[PDB]
Design a binder for these strands. Sequence first.
RNA 1: AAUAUAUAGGGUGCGGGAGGGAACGCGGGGAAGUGAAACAUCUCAGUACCCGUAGGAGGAGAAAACAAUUGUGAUUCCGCA
RNA 2: GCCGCAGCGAAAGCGAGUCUGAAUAGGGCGACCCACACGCGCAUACGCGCGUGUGAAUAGUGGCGUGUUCUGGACCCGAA
RNA 3: GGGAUGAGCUGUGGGUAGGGGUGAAAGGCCAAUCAAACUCCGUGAUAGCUGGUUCUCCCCGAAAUGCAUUUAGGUGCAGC
RNA 4: AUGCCGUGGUGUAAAGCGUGGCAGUGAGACGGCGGGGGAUAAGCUCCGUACGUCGAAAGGGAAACAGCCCAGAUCGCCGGC
RNA 5: UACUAAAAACACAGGUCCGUGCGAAGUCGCAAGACGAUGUAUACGGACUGACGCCUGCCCGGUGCUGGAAGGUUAAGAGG
RNA 6: UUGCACUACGAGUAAAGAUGCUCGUUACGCGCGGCAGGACGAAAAGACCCCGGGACCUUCACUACAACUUGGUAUUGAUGU
RNA 7: UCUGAUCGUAUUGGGCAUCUAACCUCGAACCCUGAAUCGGGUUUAGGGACAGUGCCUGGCGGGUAGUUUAACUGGGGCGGUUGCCUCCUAAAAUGUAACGGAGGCGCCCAAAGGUUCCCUCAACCUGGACGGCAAUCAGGUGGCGAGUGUAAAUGCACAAGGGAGCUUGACUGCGAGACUUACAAGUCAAGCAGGGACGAAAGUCGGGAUUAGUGAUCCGGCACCCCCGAGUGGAAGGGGUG
Lengths: 62, 96, 74, 48
Amino acid sequence: PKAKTHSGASKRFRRTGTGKIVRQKANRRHLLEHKPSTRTRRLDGRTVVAANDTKRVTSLLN
Amino acid sequence: EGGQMPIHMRLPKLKGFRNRFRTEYEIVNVGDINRLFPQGGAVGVDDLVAKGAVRKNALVKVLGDGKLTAKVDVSAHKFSGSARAKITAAGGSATE
Amino acid sequence: SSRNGRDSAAQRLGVKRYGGQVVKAGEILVRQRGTKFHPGVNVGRGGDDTLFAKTAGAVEFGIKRGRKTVSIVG
Amino acid sequence: VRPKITLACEVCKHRNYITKKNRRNDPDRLELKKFCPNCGKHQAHRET
RNA sequence: AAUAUAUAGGGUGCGGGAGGGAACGCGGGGAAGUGAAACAUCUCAGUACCCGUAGGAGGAGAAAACAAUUGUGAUUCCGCA
RNA sequence: GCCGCAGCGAAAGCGAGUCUGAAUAGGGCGACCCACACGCGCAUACGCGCGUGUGAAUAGUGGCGUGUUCUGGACCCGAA
RNA sequence: GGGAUGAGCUGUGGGUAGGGGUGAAAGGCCAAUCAAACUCCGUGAUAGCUGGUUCUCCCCGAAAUGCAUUUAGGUGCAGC
RNA sequence: AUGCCGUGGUGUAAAGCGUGGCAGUGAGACGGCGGGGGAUAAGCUCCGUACGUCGAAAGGGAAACAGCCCAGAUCGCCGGC
RNA sequence: UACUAAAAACACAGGUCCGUGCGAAGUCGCAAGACGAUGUAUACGGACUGACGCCUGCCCGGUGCUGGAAGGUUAAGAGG
RNA sequence: UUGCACUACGAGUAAAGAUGCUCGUUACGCGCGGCAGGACGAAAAGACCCCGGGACCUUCACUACAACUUGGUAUUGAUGU
RNA sequence: UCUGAUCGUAUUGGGCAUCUAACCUCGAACCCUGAAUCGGGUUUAGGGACAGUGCCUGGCGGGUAGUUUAACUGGGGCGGUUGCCUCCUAAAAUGUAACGGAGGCGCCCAAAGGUUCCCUCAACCUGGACGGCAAUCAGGUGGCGAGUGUAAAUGCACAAGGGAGCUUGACUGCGAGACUUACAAGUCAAGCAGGGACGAAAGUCGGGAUUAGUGAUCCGGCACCCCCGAGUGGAAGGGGUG
Ligand SMILES: *C(=O)[C@H](CCSC)NC=O
Ligand SMILES: [Mg+2]
Ligand SMILES: [Mg+2]
Ligand SMILES: [Mg+2]
Ligand SMILES: [Mg+2]
Ligand SMILES: [Mg+2]
Ligand SMILES: [Mg+2]
Ligand SMILES: [Mg+2]
Ligand SMILES: [Mg+2]
Ligand SMILES: [Mg+2]
Ligand SMILES: [Mg+2]
Ligand SMILES: [Mg+2]
Ligand SMILES: [Mg+2]
Ligand SMILES: [Mg+2]
Ligand SMILES: [Mg+2]
Ligand SMILES: [Mg+2]
Ligand SMILES: [Mg+2]
Ligand SMILES: [Mg+2]
Ligand SMILES: [Mg+2]
Ligand SMILES: [Mg+2]
Ligand SMILES: [Mg+2]
Ligand SMILES: [Mg+2]
Ligand SMILES: [Mg+2]
Ligand SMILES: [Mg+2]
Ligand SMILES: [Mg+2]
Ligand SMILES: [Mg+2]
Ligand SMILES: [Mg+2]
Ligand SMILES: [Mg+2]
Ligand SMILES: [Mg+2]
Ligand SMILES: [Mg+2]
Ligand SMILES: [Mg+2]
Ligand SMILES: [Mg+2]
Ligand SMILES: [Mg+2]
Ligand SMILES: [Mg+2]
Ligand SMILES: [Mg+2]
Ligand SMILES: [Mg+2]
Ligand SMILES: [Mg+2]
Ligand SMILES: [Mg+2]
Ligand SMILES: [Mg+2]
Ligand SMILES: [Mg+2]
Ligand SMILES: [Mg+2]
Ligand SMILES: [Mg+2]
Ligand SMILES: [Mg+2]
Ligand SMILES: [Mg+2]
Ligand SMILES: [Mg+2]
Ligand SMILES: [Mg+2]
Ligand SMILES: [Mg+2]
Ligand SMILES: [Mg+2]
Ligand SMILES: [Mg+2]
Ligand SMILES: [Mg+2]
Ligand SMILES: [Mg+2]
Ligand SMILES: [Mg+2]
Ligand SMILES: [Mg+2]
Ligand SMILES: [Mg+2]
Ligand SMILES: [Mg+2]
Ligand SMILES: [Mg+2]
Ligand SMILES: [Mg+2]
Ligand SMILES: [Mg+2]
Ligand SMILES: [Mg+2]
Ligand SMILES: [Mg+2]
Ligand SMILES: [Mg+2]
Ligand SMILES: [Mg+2]
Ligand SMILES: [Mg+2]
Ligand SMILES: [Mg+2]
Ligand SMILES: [Mg+2]
Ligand SMILES: [Mg+2]
Ligand SMILES: [Mg+2]
Ligand SMILES: [Mg+2]
Ligand SMILES: [Mg+2]
Ligand SMILES: [Mg+2]
Ligand SMILES: [Mg+2]
Ligand SMILES: [Zn+2]
């Protein structure tokens, strides 16, 4: 049969134009009063999946 | 991962929705109009398919990366902003 | 039975760049609690007394009236 | 005893900031001059 | 017939049904082991099994259909999407 | 029909750019050969931008082998 | 050794069926098997557990540590 | 004292680092040295050690004797140290 | 307790309590139907005690079971 | 039942209880009849303990269903007050 | 014809009582029936819009069914413990185990924050109405033995300790470069622009001397921005940013 992909990893990861894999950062959905703006700006945006998780994340997206 | 909450449940979901009604545009640069059509002429949506620069049965869109020195008369959907500037500088026109 | 057994994490304090070592601008030099070292030329303190670098150069240590200091020779 | 109050503006009523006060030392609503990004300048802020 | 109109019932005469068959079809009832590193939602699966009923095939089939300002024009089936 | 051919953005959309933002500020992601004389407002010298090339090095996709992997009993044997 | 005219023993024929029967009650008995029979089917049930896995040679060659874990004889990632 | 971090020399093939394919291991053992728990008991237990050997290392020595001492087996020889 | 336990264990005649007014209560069945019983509270089903003799004290707060409905709380339907 | 076989004993040693290793000491080769100290004798992939799985049993563990039970509406109507 | 009262008619509900015709009867008789303690039909004697049953709905429910019931542990159970912060063990970088040794935390502060200026403490000694070892005063001596909202360590007298003035930076948009790190996270940050506070200026300010005072994802809630809007215009829903 045909290879299914993981519905959780497709909603948490995506690919850029050169094949990098990006994600969003945690600790930002709630409990935001005591977190200063130096912390919510560090946790804002996207970063690249680290080089030690890039093999399991690639074989969940595909 | 052995019992801890995995990498596909620790991280938050990517934000947003997907537009169900999104209209895509296949893409030709204006520097490929120069190389494929070095003498210019009528450049339609059908002549860009056969010369191998855009796909079949899709809405086209002419963008503006390159150097256009040919005098072309290009007909396509949804021209760009820097593309109309380079086509009319070479004496051409750009209709929808 | 015992009432002991809990400790905290290790905070990895100490001198992170030694003397003569060429640093970049912004590098954390001496992470610590309190002012065990004091900031000198081209070294700013930091919130938890972290003693970073303000300009690229070489770290050198010295004494400035009893308080031992970290400086950067540009 | 220290709830989380939120500070609404006095011109646009946007809820720009969130912080904590003591309910029994400060029974009334706090008033601070804080920067409002909609107005682009420092306005007044009561609580809600 | 009881009982009156009559019916239930009984007499007689011609047709028909019944049960079997390896698979396939349609309609109805419907598991658990299992997977979820436990488990109940969920999965396994409308699977296994059972019930009714066929035919040489069966079911569906002639728009109270899609589509999106143009249009396609009964159903089934195979390939994509 | 699929993969390649342009990316960025939650999206509208814009497009060698784009998102954020008050910003011709900074970042994110993406694009971009100066090994090359020459010509240019270059010059104590390397460069800057653009031509001319000396004609620089990209590239994918389909098949068939192999190593792992996915769904199936999935290396084989065994419960209560 | 106990009962031996009794709540006796016995023959022939019959009835009760599997979360059910029957039991002067022992979880006893239901075809030498019973804290839920037997046979076929789901079915090649599953097992973080034990056992096994077959011809040759040449080069290099570990680990038994860290962190997380309904985790501690298992596993993910790093270390080698 | 050592150890550690940077730097300038000199030496050294099979060192290092970045990125891909396939792993195994995650029960360790005794001995030297520094310690905790134990009675400064254990072939006990739990840590440190660019420390060693076994694990996965045959040979010579310690009578025998995984872990101590010497030394790391490509093959052949009725040579030598 | 067939096949390591025959007993002080079960049964028992007698006792008390509770249920049952009659296609009864109870049980077997989705139901029809059946047993109870071709019986009718001196009868039938359940629970505990266990011949006989003398006796069987105090406690209704807790948890049941039976009766009650003044008050509070409380579903679908109606209202909209 | 069975890896072998021209299968001694002592003091040692070793995975800490040796026919099989060290150093000794003892013993001609093969049968037959007896005794049961050893071969950690045979028989049963320990019933105890522990770790993982199962079954069945209990309740004021959780979540469900049958049985019993309450109300509305349908079957279901008429007239007084 | 508004507020309140009372009377009457009509149309609708809820009580109670009566009726019979639905429905009910294992009360009785008769026929099908030759043989019938079955069944059905006719008639009669009763019950009666109740009961029973369908659908919806609360209750009750070990009668029955599926399951769960953690780990570390000098065997297991019993007792204790599990995350965070500081010290010692820890062998003069960093890190390091044990059911090894001691202690803290699940907050507090609208000033105990920001800034500008000013001051030096504790203890001891001498004199003084109530007044004592010790309240407030005065003078000598005193370089840190006091103090730090809160445990410990490292800091702090240049003060980060004490006091006063004005205040909200307990900011919005960012961030070159680092620490730590399996990963998830954690932590520090020069400097640039906006609009501000204090200061004559220089400058300092993205809470508190520093390190504890906390909880990933999912699913939701609210405020605002007006991005998508299942033919179209809206809306429902979804999306972003706090
Ligand atoms: C315990 O010793 C006992 C005997 C086991 S046989 C060594 N357990 C159960 O009977
Ligand atoms: Mg949110
Ligand atoms: Mg915030
Ligand atoms: Mg405590
Ligand atoms: Mg510490
Ligand atoms: Mg106050
Ligand atoms: Mg037939
Ligand atoms: Mg199941
Ligand atoms: Mg499972
Ligand atoms: Mg499993
Ligand atoms: Mg036929
Ligand atoms: Mg047909
Ligand atoms: Mg995209
Ligand atoms: Mg840019
Ligand atoms: Mg006899
Ligand atoms: Mg006798
Ligand atoms: Mg006798
Ligand atoms: Mg029989
Ligand atoms: Mg038997
Ligand atoms: Mg069973
Ligand atoms: Mg199956
Ligand atoms: Mg198997
Ligand atoms: Mg080698
Ligand atoms: Mg867990
Ligand atoms: Mg691994
Ligand atoms: Mg590699
Ligand atoms: Mg392990
Ligand atoms: Mg281990
Ligand atoms: Mg070890
Ligand atoms: Mg030692
Ligand atoms: Mg040991
Ligand atoms: Mg091994
Ligand atoms: Mg050796
Ligand atoms: Mg070696
Ligand atoms: Mg040797
Ligand atoms: Mg030897
Ligand atoms: Mg017996
Ligand atoms: Mg009954
Ligand atoms: Mg009675
Ligand atoms: Mg009783
Ligand atoms: Mg008794
Ligand atoms: Mg009795
Ligand atoms: Mg009472
Ligand atoms: Mg002999
Ligand atoms: Mg011996
Ligand atoms: Mg010997
Ligand atoms: Mg020998
Ligand atoms: Mg003999
Ligand atoms: Mg024996
Ligand atoms: Mg034996
Ligand atoms: Mg065993
Ligand atoms: Mg109960
Ligand atoms: Mg149960
Ligand atoms: Mg199950
Ligand atoms: Mg345990
Ligand atoms: Mg113990
Ligand atoms: Mg240290
Ligand atoms: Mg050390
Ligand atoms: Mg102040
Ligand atoms: Mg102060
Ligand atoms: Mg705050
Ligand atoms: Mg940054
Ligand atoms: Mg400014
Ligand atoms: Mg001013
Ligand atoms: Mg600043
Ligand atoms: Mg802070
Ligand atoms: Mg503090
Ligand atoms: Mg979840
Ligand atoms: Mg619409
Ligand atoms: Mg909306
Ligand atoms: Mg933002
Ligand atoms: Zn405002």
